[PDB]
Design an enzyme around this catalytic site. Structure first.
Site, PDB file in Angstrom:
ATOM      1  N   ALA A  38       4.119  39.655  24.505  1.00 35.86           N
ATOM      2  CA  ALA A  38       5.239  39.797  25.427  1.00 35.86           C
ATOM      3  C   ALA A  38       6.294  38.725  25.178  1.00 35.86           C
ATOM      4  O   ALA A  38       6.184  37.939  24.236  1.00 35.86           O
ATOM      5  CB  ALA A  38       4.750  39.734  26.866  1.00 35.86           C
ATOM      6  N   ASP A  39       7.315  38.698  26.027  1.00 32.05           N
ATOM      7  CA  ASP A  39       8.391  37.721  25.898  1.00 32.05           C
ATOM      8  C   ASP A  39       8.404  36.767  27.089  1.00 32.05           C
ATOM      9  O   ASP A  39       7.609  36.909  28.018  1.00 32.05           O
ATOM     10  CB  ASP A  39       9.741  38.430  25.782  1.00 32.05           C
ATOM     11  CG  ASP A  39       9.962  39.033  24.409  1.00 32.05           C
ATOM     12  OD1 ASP A  39      10.299  38.275  23.475  1.00 32.05           O
ATOM     13  OD2 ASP A  39       9.799  40.263  24.269  1.00 32.05           O
ATOM     14  N   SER A  40       9.310  35.796  27.053  1.00 33.79           N
ATOM     15  CA  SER A  40       9.423  34.816  28.127  1.00 33.79           C
ATOM     16  C   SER A  40       9.549  35.506  29.482  1.00 33.79           C
ATOM     17  O   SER A  40       9.107  34.979  30.504  1.00 33.79           O
ATOM     18  CB  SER A  40      10.630  33.907  27.891  1.00 33.79           C
ATOM     19  OG  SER A  40      10.796  33.626  26.512  1.00 33.79           O
TER      20      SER A  40
END
Length: 80
Positions: A38-40
């Site tokens: 996933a991302d931040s």
């Protein structure tokens, strides 16, 4: 106090509502970006969800350290 059986389903529930995958595939030792990929945005999403649902105190600092499943589950589980 809250039983680990509750936090487990709770934490997983959110992670599922945020990402949309199977809570099973989500490893405890794995992270939100490491394995999940996933991302931040994902991490931050879980953070707010915790301080919102679990009503825990996860400020910027605690938010920077809690960027992994094990880390998150550990914090909440520790803050019963």
């Amino acid at each position: 106090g809250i039983p680990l059986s509750n936090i487990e389903e709770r934490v997983k529930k959110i992670i599922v509502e945020q990402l949309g995958v199977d809570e099973a595939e989500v490893k405890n030792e794995a992270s939100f970006v490491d394995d999940l990929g996933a991302d931040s945005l994902d991490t931050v999403e879980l953070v707010m969800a915790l301080e919102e649902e679990f009503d825990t105190e996860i400020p910027d600092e605690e938010a920077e350290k809690i960027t992994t499943v094990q880390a998150a589950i550990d914090y909440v589980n520790s803050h019963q």
